[model samples]
Target chain A: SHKQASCPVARPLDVIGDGWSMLIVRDAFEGLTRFGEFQKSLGLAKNILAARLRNLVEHGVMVAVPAESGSHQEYRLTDKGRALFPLLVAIRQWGEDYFFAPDESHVRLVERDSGQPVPRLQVRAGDGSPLAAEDTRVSR
Target chain B: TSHKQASCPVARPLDVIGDGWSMLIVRDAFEGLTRFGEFQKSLGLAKNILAARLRNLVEHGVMVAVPAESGSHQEYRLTDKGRALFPLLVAIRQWGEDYFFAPDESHVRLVERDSGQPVPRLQVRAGDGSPLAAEDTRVSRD
Candidate 1:
């Protein structure tokens, strides 16, 4: 089911592409809020963190919900942002599999029960088959 | 397999995630040599287009070449920088499959020959052997 957004892929990528933004999104899903907390955790420049938060809010990914019992505000993911969970996991899976070595994968995305590295993202034969890169493209 | 770093799924995404880079790379790979001609014809970018990017990639361990003819060459595989691009390729394939397919897709068959399922990206599972969707993950950097 598509939405009212045109070019959602590019639009979302625009906000999340900057390394820090997705990290923020990742943390947001974990219930991290507040400027100082993000600022301290990410070690980002204050200006950059502020801009990211503002951008996230602008894009409707985060809403500036007022903090409980305080004058300050905290960021919360909108329903739309919450819907991006699967895509986020997919991206993370690809990164952990190909970019990290086996031993260094301290937090292996495993078969939550089996304790094995999860299968990473892949492309296969055009026949809807699992093909290696050598087989996937045009062979001259 | 030549690397041992923080290979996040986004690492693959970052490989060819943005812009026209992947499209151009595929177009160039369509050519015969790892040399300059293929890249230029494919990209229509400036003369520096293929040369500079190729050079930088070579420097970055994203690509390697082997001398074929007397002095000719060929690009063999996607470096971690390049191979990590599975999802971007998937993204492109998904776009092409959706927008360009006819009653029968012409240039390519994206569906698996065996199962007829689309050639999706890596499938994930959780500790319980359940299919792990994005919600199943927790992200932190090294």
Candidate 2:
């Protein structure tokens, strides 16, 4: 079950709550690893990107991995970060469905093995029944 | 699938819905509040703030306006995309219920529609139904 991380803020949400961090995390999932790449993709200022990046790195959602050159280090999603796939999917899918007009064009997440779109993510019970927020409980 | 823009999913709706006010507006939408007056009374947000955020939410496509059956005040309804955010809200509700509230402090509860049984906690799991730890998975580029 998704347990609260105890940091008061939700995990990815807390770390990425400024909203850029999740975008940064989303970029990380898509294979963008360099400082300049994120800056370019996000069109965010270098200083702002640096702060979000640093916050993520410190939070263990990302780690400094090998880069193509010494000029900059690459960033990779840690397991904790990758675990956010569903969360990201929830956000992305919602935007894709509602944020865009019917004629609007947008990006899609792909599956490496099948080269198809990633399946829709949903909340479910242990028995495989669909679970809504109304169905869940909070416990110690 | 062809157009390549920003990589992650946080930008679009997050622009209008990421803040606490927007978040609560969407939350109230899930609870079946469809009118400006209804949301205002439920959230107690400043009238100006609620009106602006509702406009933003409508502009962003998270919710849409419908002709009211009786009066000039419009009724807003969640688009399919808005309903998809139920999971996201559940995540937040669960987290707040877990950490923010003190034990023995009574608060609202979310329950299933048909059975009315409390929903199970949201989890990240493997294909085999085992709980996955935060450190066990990695994002892949392939």
Candidate 3:
């Protein structure tokens, strides 16, 4: 994690912290598992994609499994990768809130069963009250 | 907030989000920093790079410029949108705690004010209170 032996942010940044890396993980979440599919979805160069995929696999966030074709291997998210779901949602929520101009169109994250957008996410106390940055402190 | 992923949502946010510099800057804001000098002192970057980041953040509406209460110089504060990044920051910090640290490593902690308990792990749960994974969700676009 970049010898970030200190700060919290730097460690994760060292792992899946690049644009391509995160984008690859994001696509994987959408059920895009094949190399060609990620390449098409991201429009990334093959070499770059290959390197990032290898890196993700090495980190154990993704696993390379045999594809149904048996001729090729497809990438699947490990539990570590699945654990990243909240982080991705956090990024998407922030983007949905601020990045788009009013009346502009974009995608949304939703539940499969209810077919509804998930409720806004929050960092809550044990009591389930929403907590803000001001209500928290960083202690060593 | 991690290194990758933006295809499904706003390429809008990805256009603005980059690596660590800007994010660390935003992190400091949530920590209660409000001035150019404070950020400079905290981040220890060159004046020009810091200026560039502040410009990008302000331009994006995640942060806005305001007058300092004491000094004559301008101060920066997170917008409503910026404050909304609380969950994202929490996620990033928690990931670091879980994956980035060795057991013996010493680092900062995010704790609640009243009980002083470390914040719980942030999770994506369905309305039924079941935990969610990437497979349990889908992206619906316009």
Candidate 4:
């Protein structure tokens, strides 16, 4: 088997390892479906943003659909794209934890219903115990 | 007290260890590979590239180079900050397993050392413990 095919982590990164692509996915999760919206939110150049969007669509992470106004196209996350939520959350949480000092503040992801900050994510084993890096092994 | 153009939390981490090779090296580190040659062997990457990545990782505080127990070579170990990336790596691995592999296809698994059961798919949970989807959350900068 191909090296990329054999490694699950590498495979997804092949599809979305670039910073811009993953940021685009993050914005999509936040409900920015229009091209202009993403550009405005990300402040990315038009040509580069266009290519990343096309790449996402080609990979089935997102789909281009007609806007409700019937004038322009909108990019919506496919199920596969939405499935990246956990990854995005993990990135945000890690960034918040490491990039910002305890006294410093940054953006936060909070529950829509409760307005409480989402808890930190944990990697738990089958028996429901939290796992550290040493407690796990990669079975290749 | 002001908020400029909000910096993206996701982008910050991505700027450091976001590349395929960098994360793969992290994956190898988690697997207990410490020697420089060991990383090169497992990833099949050039020594120069591996050296640069390792350098960057150390600079970013994700990894550190310590003297080998045998004192013959240097060993790369994950820092506390680096170990914090476990959830992100697991999330990526779980997604890769779900989307990249065919139903009939078999791939590597990350399992518990004791029970050997595969770790469950990671989920974003709310305060009350229910799983939260992307729609159920919103970004706030206050």
Winning model by DockQ: 4
Model 2 alpha-carbon drift over 4 Å, by segment: A1-19, A31-34, A54-80, A99-107, A125-127, A131-140, B1-10, B41-44, B65-74, B91-109, B121-142
Q: Which digits, one per residue and each the tens of the lDDT, describe model 4 over residues B1-142?
A: 0112247778888777656688889999888899999999998888998999999899888999999887688999999999899999999999898888878888889988877878888888888778888888898874
On lDDT, the candidate that comes out on top is 4
Candidate 1 ranges with C-alpha deviation above 4 Å? A1-13, A54-71, A77-105, A110-140, B1-52, B66-76, B88-123, B127-129, B139-142
Give lDDT tens digits, candidate 1, residues B73-114: 654445665555445445544443343234443444344444
Ranking by DockQ: 4, 3, 2, 1
Candidate 3 residue pairs that clash: A16-B3, A17-B3, A18-B3, A21-B4, A22-B4, A22-B5, A23-B4, A23-B5
In TM-score terms, which candidate is top? 4
DockQ of each: 0.22, 0.22, 0.66, 0.83
Q: Write the per-residue lDDT of candidate 3 for residues A18-127, one digit (tens) a residue.
A: 66777778888888889999999888889989998998898888999998879988999888887788988888888777655686667788897777787677788878
Position B91, candidate 1: lDDT: 51
- TM-scores of all candidate predictions against the true structure: 0.58, 0.65, 0.88, 0.94
Model 2 TM-score on a 0 to 1 scale: 0.65
Over B1-142, each residue of candidate 2 has an lDDT whose tens digit, in order, gives 2122343345775675555566677777776789889999976778998898898878766789998999877899987767777887766566555544458565566666665455666765544456543334433343
Docking class of 2: incorrect
Question: What total of clashing residue pairs does each candidate reach?
Answer: 31, 6, 8, 0
Candidate 4: pairs in clash: none
- Interface RMSD of candidate 3, in Å, is 1.8
Candidate 2 chain A, poorest ten consecutive residues by summed lDDT: A1-10
lDDT of 3 by residue, B65-128 (tens): 9887887899898889777878988998898788767799889999998897998888787777
Q: Which scores greater on lDDT, model 1 or model 2?
A: 2
DockQ of 2: 0.22
